[PDB]
Amino acid sequence: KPGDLVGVNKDSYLILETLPTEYDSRVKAMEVDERPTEQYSDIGGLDKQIQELVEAIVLPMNHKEKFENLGIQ
Amino acid sequence: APAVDTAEQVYISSLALLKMLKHGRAGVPMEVMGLMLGEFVDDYTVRVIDVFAMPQSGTGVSVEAVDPVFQAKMLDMLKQTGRPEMVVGWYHSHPGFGCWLSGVDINTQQSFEALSERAVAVVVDPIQSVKGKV
Numbered sequence: 001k002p003g004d005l006v007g008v009n010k011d012s013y014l015i016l017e018t019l020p021t022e023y024d025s026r027v028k029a030m031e032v033d034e035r036p037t038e039q040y041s042d043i044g045g046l047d048k049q050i051q052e053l054v055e056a057i058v059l060p061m062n063h064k065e066k067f068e069n070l071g072i073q
Numbered sequence: 074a075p076a077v078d079t080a081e082q083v084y085i086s087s088l089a090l091l092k093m094l095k096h097g098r099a100g101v102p103m104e105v106m107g108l109m110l111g112e113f114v115d116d117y118t119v120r121v122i123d124v125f126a127m128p129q130s131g132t133g134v135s136v137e138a139v140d141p142v143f144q145a146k147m148l149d150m151l152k153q154t155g156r157p158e159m160v161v162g163w164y165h166s167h168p169g170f171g172c173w174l175s176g177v178d179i180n181t182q183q184s185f186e187a188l189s190e191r192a193v194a195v196v197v198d199p200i201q202s203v204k205g206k207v
Contacts, residue, residue: 009131010132011103011131011132012102
């Protein structure tokens with residue numbers, strides 16, 4: 001299957017064996033910077049911009065069920 | 074007091090040579106090996122009546138590949154056919170360089186020497202033979 005590392009014979013080129021899928025440790029470390037939380041209490045400025053952003057990302061993730069029912073993107 | 078234990082000039086019959094050329098040719102770039110069966114008479118003549126290949130090696134002509142078990146298994150069969158012959162030596166192919174043994178291959182060669190002193194090692198190059206004695 002795709003994304004799987006394989007062994008190829010050195011002497012005559014045929015795929016002999018399989019090896020574990022490669023992942024990257026570096027990506028895992030980068031993840032979850034949510035702590036400490038930023039909130040809107042040490043990040044801010046530009047009152048309108050912050051409001052539109054809350055409307056575009058934050059609310060549709062919680063309020064997800066409704067969108068499906070209404071039929072609207 | 075001294076003994077013989079010399080390498081005598083090897084008399085290769087027409088069928089055995091063809092079997093070596095064919096074994097090698099399919100067998101390369103992979104290093105491969107097989108055994109030589111014949112009769113040795115006198116102290117000057119070894120005749121190589123026939124050969125067959127005893128399972129072909131992977132990377133190198135490995136010491137794993139030399140197998141007394143396979144050698145034993147094949148040898149008892151021959152007796153039942155009414156052609157009992159002895160292992161005169163063994164052959165191998167190297168495409169690496171003409172007339173050369175690999176590092177692994179010298180260790181492998183030693184198992185055959187212990188069995189019989191008149192064990193010989195034939196290097197076949199199918200890449201570089203276009204007269205087939207060359």
